[PDB]
Amino acid sequence: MKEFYLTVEQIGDSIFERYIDSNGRERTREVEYKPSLFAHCPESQATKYFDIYGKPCTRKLFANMRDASQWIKRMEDIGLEALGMDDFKLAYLSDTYNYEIKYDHTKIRVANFDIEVTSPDGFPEPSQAKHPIDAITHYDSIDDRFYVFDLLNSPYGNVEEWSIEIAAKLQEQGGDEVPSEIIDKIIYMPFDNEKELLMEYLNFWQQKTPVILTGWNVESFAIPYVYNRIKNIFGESTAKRLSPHRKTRVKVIENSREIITLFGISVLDYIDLYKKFSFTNQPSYSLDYISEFELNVGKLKYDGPISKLRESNHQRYISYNIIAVYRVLQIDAKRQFINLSLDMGYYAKIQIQSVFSPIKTWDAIIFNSLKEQNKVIPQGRSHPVQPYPGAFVKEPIPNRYKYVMSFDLTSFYPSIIRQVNISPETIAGTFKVAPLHDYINAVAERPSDVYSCSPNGMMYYKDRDGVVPTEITKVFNQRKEHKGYMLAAQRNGEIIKEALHNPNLSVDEPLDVDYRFDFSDEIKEKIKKLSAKSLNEMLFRAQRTEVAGMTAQINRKLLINSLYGALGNVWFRYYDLRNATAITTFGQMALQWIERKVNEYLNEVCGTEGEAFVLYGDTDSIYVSADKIIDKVGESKFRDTNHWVDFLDKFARERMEPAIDRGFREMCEYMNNKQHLMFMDREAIAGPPLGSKGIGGFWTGKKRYALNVWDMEGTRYAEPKLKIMGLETQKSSTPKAVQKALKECIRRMLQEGEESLQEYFKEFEKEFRQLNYISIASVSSANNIAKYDVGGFPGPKCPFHIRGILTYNRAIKGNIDAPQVVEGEKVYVLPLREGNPFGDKCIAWPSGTEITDLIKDDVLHWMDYTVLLEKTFIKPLEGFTSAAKLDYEKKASLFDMFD
DNA sequence: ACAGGTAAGCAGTCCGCG
DNA sequence: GCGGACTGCTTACC
Ligand SMILES: O=c1ccn([C@H]2C[C@H](O)[C@@H](COP(=O)(O)NP(=O)(O)OP(=O)(O)O)O2)c(=O)[nH]1
Ligand SMILES: [Ca+2]
Ligand SMILES: [Ca+2]
Ligand SMILES: [Ca+2]
Ligand code: NA
Ligand code: NA
Ligand code: NA
Ligand code: NA
Ligand code: NA
Ligand code: NA
Ligand code: NA
Ligand code: NA
């Protein structure tokens, strides 16, 4: 096979690389890499090197990387540009791997690990590491084995060995329910003291040195705790064995927190992968909470605090450590963020951990692209941060909206880049700008008949291929492929959901099918003959396939959109507000241009004049009122809901879209752009069920609306799905039970009508005081707690949730065991009734947890349900209903005086 | 440091206001 | 005594 790197590091004048060779074997080499950099040279000097603007350069070869760095400094002291890749690791990778890297993941050692540390005096700070590590579970992807290191003897208690027999048993048997599929993969190792455990773990680490190191909070806890514990016991030299090159770096942050860099290892903390690639915002990021959300597994159960779990139930203590490791593996099997990181890393030719940085990622992609044409990248430059304009958002008229069709553009900003040909080296000049509405209304004079233009005043060459459009197109094409798999899996899911209405009472097996492609008629025929058992399993596999496609497509979209963003970041080598503004301004034009065209077209085909069909728009999307399109045929002519949905689906696809296409083609000609790439397709078809009292949808303002959708991007839902954007139901800060209640309120409004809403509201008001306290607690991030802490009491302008944290700290003051609120993390927040013993109007505690038993009964007694209801529930419901012009309570009338 | 701008709602402080 | 304007903070949409 073709060789590929695993890790790369620069240590002085040496490049340390771990790699898989042509025979599939892992090797490590030290290379005294000789880097090249470039300087501008006279035009009379023949050369094959030119900067991106066509200016000749000469290559400077250096004896070592230090000499190259020193040359950069001297060139700065002179005041001349030093061109070329200044990150020598990237240059080395580009030189060593001058081809499209095809990698074998089975050869890459991916380690998942988690440690346990018993601490009687609160959280065990990794920088201090003063408590023994009494458990380590380390999963190796090559061995496919869970290596368990169990400390039997500790100053905090001596315990018996963990039993794998009891671990495998059901909880109803007094067992731990360690999943049966990993029982045979567990390698258990007990130790009679910590030093022997740690020394053995280090020897194990050397035999099976991780390339990718992951787990949950491993970067902020596990890794620095292990490193510091070993350092304090054996000394620094021994602790450095955690690095295959014996090189570590301790980066410190004083509040005393440390993040350790282990040279020769690529750490991908799964919590960071999750936060960056999952596109969620969670009320809590404990592994317990995320596992429940992602996998629908039950919360792990135990009696008493975790600080005494080992002493009381060491059996369960070890089993849960093992399970914790497995849960992350299970989450990755679903989300596949590791696969994504490897894909993007090898594509860009970067250190795998650099997938967290789209700027580093794009710098390497662009550098490799340019290097292939003997072109020389410019030197990075210092720039001041400056604001610049973005997208346009229309101000909607707050109202209900019965029938709605939405449209938006495919990969908006990257498509603008490709269409206009926006790149650092394709800039041709400028023109005099007319007001933006003059271009929107096709009144302003044509910017140029030679160059491709944006209404911000920028002109670009039409003939030349720009490196930014060239490379963004490649990644965009990957994105488009994976989205196809996602939507097909999604459409397949609905087919299965339909067949789950007539499950055949028989015994069979799920059909072997590739869910990435639309089911063939043969498959569909067989599906209508399957048992509920097989169908539900197929639905599970379809949804897993969809999530896999979702991860692949949405994060490639994120990457290309971040290339747009990078143009507006001063640390990007190709930072340029001219290009960034060219993109957003063109986008503003395009949206408001097509709003006009759509309005004009619909009035024409309907026969009316001057009526507003586009009720709302944001960035690249429009929302079209389809009431008059429906009324043109009259509701009577429709058999059922699905009939008019088919009608609108056809109408948009056969009539509106071609008109939209003509409109954008004209705009492309107007701006004399390189290639027409404004592709606007139908998104949602929304409306009430036929013959119902549902209102279909409503807007309360910008970025706040709800729609009862029947079809979304070609997916015909088995049951109508609510599309709610911005409303409190969508916010992680809104209490769980309130989200649920508000959503059902919205469902009833859009699908059933006012009377249904009023029934549900009355019921919720009566019964809500029985809801679990966690389900009705608000959530908030806890930033700058100390900033507002004046002697344990709220300082000036102390935020509500911060006030609640201070209340908590006073209540638990003097308890070294009580859970402490962590700066930057999230808290549950509850209001307290007047005269409560806590001395304040609210209290907060670490999210994802039960509040400590020290004060739990007191908090439950003094919760302010009244404030909770009015503030979190009634107030936003009032906003929904006022906009929709409805009432959630029966109003008073003259009829009230009849019996 | 190490993708971007737009925009919503909640709550605290201050100032005008017989 | 507190409404309205303004600010900080948080978390959305795109
Ligand atoms: O995170 C984002 C999201 C959107 N945007 C900008 C660029 C994007 O093209 C534009 C439209 O947002 P969309 O939600 O429509 N995503 P996009 O148009 O890129 O892709 P697609 O609609 O094909 O999925 O808003 C960002 O800059 N960052
Ligand atoms: Ca011993
Ligand atoms: Ca779009
Ligand atoms: Ca059937
Ligand atoms: Na743990
Ligand atoms: Na059970
Ligand atoms: Na130390
Ligand atoms: Na689309
Ligand atoms: Na007319
Ligand atoms: Na959009
Ligand atoms: Na189309
Ligand atoms: Na879409």
DSSP of A13-46: TEEEEEEE-TTS-EEEEEE----EEEEE--TTS-
Q: How far is CA A884 from the centre of its chain?
A: 32
Residues in contact with A894: Cβ distance below 8 Å, sequence separation at least 6, in sequence order: none
Please give the DSSP secondary-structure letter assigned to residue A810. Answer: H
CA-closest candidate to residue A258, choices A214, A222, A215: A222
Cα–Cα distance for residue pair A274/A338, rounded to 1 Å: 10
Cα–Cα distance for residue pair A585/A433, rounded to 1 Å: 12
The ligand that comes nearest to the alpha carbon of residue A663 is 11
Burial class (CB in 10 A: 0-12, 13-18, 19+), A44: exposed
The DSSP string of A388-407 is -----B--PPPEE-SSEEEE
Please give the DSSP secondary-structure letter assigned to residue A870. Answer: I
Cα–Cα distance for residue pair A502/A500, rounded to 1 Å: 5
Give A682 Cα–ligand 12 centroid separation in angstroms: 9
- Which of residues 670 to 729 on A have a Cβ less than 7 angstroms from any strand C atom? 703, 724-726
Atom of ligand 1 nearest to the CA of A621: 15
Phi, psi of A135 (to 5 degrees): -165, 135
Sign of the CA dihedral with A431 first, then A434, A440, and A443 last: negative
User: Is the separation of the CB atoms in A421 and A674 below 8 Å?
Assistant: yes
Give A603 Cα–ligand 9 centroid separation in angstroms: 7
Pairing outcome for strands A697-701 and A680-686: unpaired
Q: How far is CA A521 from the centre of its chain?
A: 36
Amino acid at A754: E
- Cα A608–Cα A610–Cα A616 angle in degrees, nearest 5: 110
Residue A566, SS3 per DSSP: helix
- A731 CB closer than 7 A to any strand C atom: yes
User: Is the separation of the CB atoms in A334 and A190 below 8 Å?
Assistant: no
CA-closest candidate to residue A719, choices A729, A709, A707: A709
Cα–Cα distance for residue pair A376/A39, rounded to 1 Å: 9
Where is A84: in which H helix or E strand?
none
CA-closest candidate to residue A710, choices A699, A729, A723: A723
CA-closest candidate to residue A399, choices A879, A885, A894, A886: A885
Give A186 Cα–ligand 5 centroid separation in angstroms: 18
Residue nearest to atom 19 of ligand 1 (CA): A411
**Nearest nucleotide (C1') to alpha carbon of A729:** C12
Give, in Å, how far the C1' of B9 lies from the CA of A747.
22
CA-closest candidate to residue A150, choices A38, A317, A282, A289: A317
Where is A153: in which H helix or E strand?
strand A153-154
Cα–Cα distance for residue pair A456/A224, rounded to 1 Å: 50
Where is A318: in which H helix or E strand?
helix A314-335
User: Is the separation of the CB atoms in A424 and A579 below 8 Å?
Assistant: yes
CA-closest candidate to residue A339, choices A488, A136, A482: A482
Cα–Cα distance for residue pair A719/A714, rounded to 1 Å: 15
Q: Would you state the torsion angle of the CA atoms of residues A80, A81, A84, A87, taken in this order, to the nearest 10 degrees?
A: 90
Q: What is the CA radius of gyration of chain A?
A: 31
Cα–Cα distance for residue pair A149/A665, rounded to 1 Å: 66
Q: Is A691 left (phi over 0), alpha (psi -120 to 50) or beta?
A: left
**Nearest nucleotide (C1') to alpha carbon of A363:** B2
Give A708 Cα–ligand 4 centroid separation in angstroms: 28
User: Is the separation of the CB atoms in A57 and A47 below 8 Å?
Assistant: yes
Question: CATH: 3.90.1600.10, 3.40.50.620, 3.40.50.300, 3.10.20.30. Which one for A380-465+570-726?
Answer: 3.90.1600.10
Q: Which two tokens stand for residue A709?
A: 């959708």
Q: Produce one character per residue of A782-810: b if its CB has 16 or more CB atoms within 10 Å, e if not.
A: beebeebbeeeebeeebbebbbbbbbbbe
Residues in contact with A784: Cβ distance below 8 Å, sequence separation at least 6, in sequence order: A802, A823
**A77: Cα within 13 Å, side-chain hemisphere:** 6
- A885 CB closer than 7 A to any strand C atom: no
- A829 CB closer than 7 A to any strand C atom: no
User: Is the separation of the CB atoms in A789 and A782 below 8 Å?
Assistant: no
* Distance from the first to the final alpha carbon of chain A: 88
Cα–Cα distance for residue pair A65/A13, rounded to 1 Å: 5
Give how far Cα A660 sits from Cα of A630, A652, A734, Å. Answer: 20, 10, 39
Cα–Cα distance for residue pair A190/A719, rounded to 1 Å: 54
User: Is the separation of the CB atoms in A75 and A67 below 8 Å?
Assistant: no
Q: How many CB atoms lie within 10 A of CB A693?
A: 14
Same fold, A1-108+337-379 and A466-569: no
> A413, A481, A712: which to mutate for ligand 1, most atoms within 8 A of CB?
A413
Q: Which two tokens stand for residue A104?
A: 């074998």
Domain coordinates of chain A in residue numbers? 1-108+337-379, 109-336, 380-465+570-726, 466-569, 727-771+864-885, 772-863
Residues with CB under 6 A from ligand 1: A 408-413, 557, 561, 564-565, 619-620
Cα–Cα distance for residue pair A84/A65, rounded to 1 Å: 13
Give, in Å, how far the C1' of B6 lies from the CA of A243.
45
Residue A113, SS3 per DSSP: strand
Residue A282, SS3 per DSSP: coil
Cα–Cα distance for residue pair A422/A457, rounded to 1 Å: 13
- A780 CB closer than 7 A to any strand C atom: yes
Give, in Å, how far the C1' of B17 lies from the CA of A460.
59
- Which of residues 52 to 111 on A have a Cβ less than 7 angstroms from any strand B atom? none
Residue nearest to atom 11 of ligand 1 (CA): A412
Amino acid at A570: V
Q: Which segments of A673-741 are extended strands (E)?
A: 680-686, 697-701, 704-712, 715-725
Phi, psi of A324 (to 5 degrees): -55, -40
Please give the DSSP secondary-structure letter assigned to residue A410. Answer: T
Sign of the CA dihedral with A433 first, then A438, A444, and A446 last: positive
The three-state (H, E, C) secondary structure of A602-656, written as one string:
HHHHHCCCCCCCEEEEECCEEEEECHHHHHHHCHHHCCCHHHHHHHHHHHHHHHH
CATH topology assigned to domain A109-336: Nucleotidyltransferase; domain 5 (3.30.420)
Q: Which two tokens stand for residue A781?
A: 């991030």
Instruction: Report the residue count for chain A.
Output: 899
User: Is the separation of the CB atoms in A51 and A40 below 8 Å?
Assistant: yes
- A566 CB closer than 7 A to any strand B atom: yes
CATH of domain A772-863: 3.40.1820.10
Q: How many CB atoms lie within 10 A of CB A502?
A: 11
Give, in Å, how far the C1' of B2 lies from the CA of A385.
14
Give how far Cα A585 sits from Cα of A388, A395, A552, Å. Answer: 10, 18, 29
- Cα A762–Cα A767–Cα A768 angle in degrees, nearest 5: 100
Sign of the CA dihedral with A480 first, then A482, A488, and A490 last: negative
Helices (H) and strands (E) in chain A, counts: 27, 33
Residue A442, SS3 per DSSP: coil
User: Is the separation of the CB atoms in A734 and A778 below 8 Å?
Assistant: yes
Please give the DSSP secondary-structure letter assigned to residue A430. Answer: E
- Cα A331–Cα A335–Cα A338 angle in degrees, nearest 5: 90
Amino acid at A676: H
Q: Is A885 left (phi over 0), alpha (psi -120 to 50) or beta?
A: left
Phi, psi of A351 (to 5 degrees): -60, 135
Residue in this structure with the two tokens 């054996």, named with its chain if needed = A234
Technique behind the model:
X-ray
- A784 CB closer than 7 A to any strand C atom: yes
Where is A729: in which H helix or E strand?
none
Residue A56, SS3 per DSSP: strand
Residues in contact with A396: Cβ distance below 8 Å, sequence separation at least 6, in sequence order: A615, A616, A699, A701, A702, A705
User: Is the separation of the CB atoms in A838 and A851 below 8 Å?
Assistant: no
Sign of the CA dihedral with A721 first, then A724, A728, and A734 last: positive
- A562 CB closer than 7 A to any strand B atom: yes
Cα–Cα distance for residue pair A112/A148, rounded to 1 Å: 12
Give, in Å, how far the C1' of B15 lies from the CA of A887.
36
Give A360 Cα–ligand 3 centroid separation in angstroms: 25
CA-closest candidate to residue A274, choices A216, A222, A357: A216
Cα–Cα distance for residue pair A575/A380, rounded to 1 Å: 9
**Nearest nucleotide (C1') to alpha carbon of A392:** B6
CA-closest candidate to residue A687, choices A605, A744, A607, A623: A623
Domain A727-771+864-885: CATH architecture, name and number where available: Up-down Bundle (1.20)
User: Is the separation of the CB atoms in A697 and A686 below 8 Å?
Assistant: yes
Chain B positions with an atom below 7 A of a protein C-beta are 1-14
The DSSP string of A818-851 is SPPPPTTSEEEEEEB-TT-TTSSSEEEEETTSPP
Range list of H helices, A429-531: 436-440, 467-499, 521-527
Cα–Cα distance for residue pair A521/A503, rounded to 1 Å: 18
Cα–Cα distance for residue pair A560/A413, rounded to 1 Å: 9
Give how far Cα A746 sits from Cα of A218, A379, A733, Å. Answer: 41, 54, 18
Please give the DSSP secondary-structure letter assigned to residue A353. Answer: G
Question: CATH: 1.10.287.690, 3.40.50.720, 3.40.1280.10, 2.60.40.10. Which one for A466-569?
Answer: 1.10.287.690
Where is A262: in which H helix or E strand?
strand A257-262
User: Is the separation of the CB atoms in A661 and A377 below 8 Å?
Assistant: no
Residue A116, SS3 per DSSP: strand
Where is A431: in which H helix or E strand?
none
- A746 CB closer than 7 A to any strand C atom: no
Q: In what order do the strands lie in the sheet with A26-31?
A: A4-11, A14-20, A26-31
CA-closest candidate to residue A632, choices A611, A653, A615, A617: A611
Residues in contact with A875: Cβ distance below 8 Å, sequence separation at least 6, in sequence order: none
Cα–Cα distance for residue pair A19/A3, rounded to 1 Å: 7
Residue A95, SS3 per DSSP: helix
Atom of ligand 1 nearest to the CA of A558: 1
- A18 CB closer than 7 A to any strand B atom: no
Sign of the CA dihedral with A229 first, then A231, A234, and A238 last: positive
Give A199 Cα–ligand 1 centroid separation in angstroms: 51
Domain A1-108+337-379: CATH architecture, name and number where available: 2-Layer Sandwich (3.30)
Cα–Cα distance for residue pair A102/A679, rounded to 1 Å: 33
Cα–Cα distance for residue pair A141/A873, rounded to 1 Å: 48
Cα–Cα distance for residue pair A612/A702, rounded to 1 Å: 17
Give A234 Cα–ligand 2 centroid separation in angstroms: 16
Chain C positions with an atom below 7 A of a protein C-beta are 8-14
Pairing outcome for strands A789-790 and A793-794: antiparallel
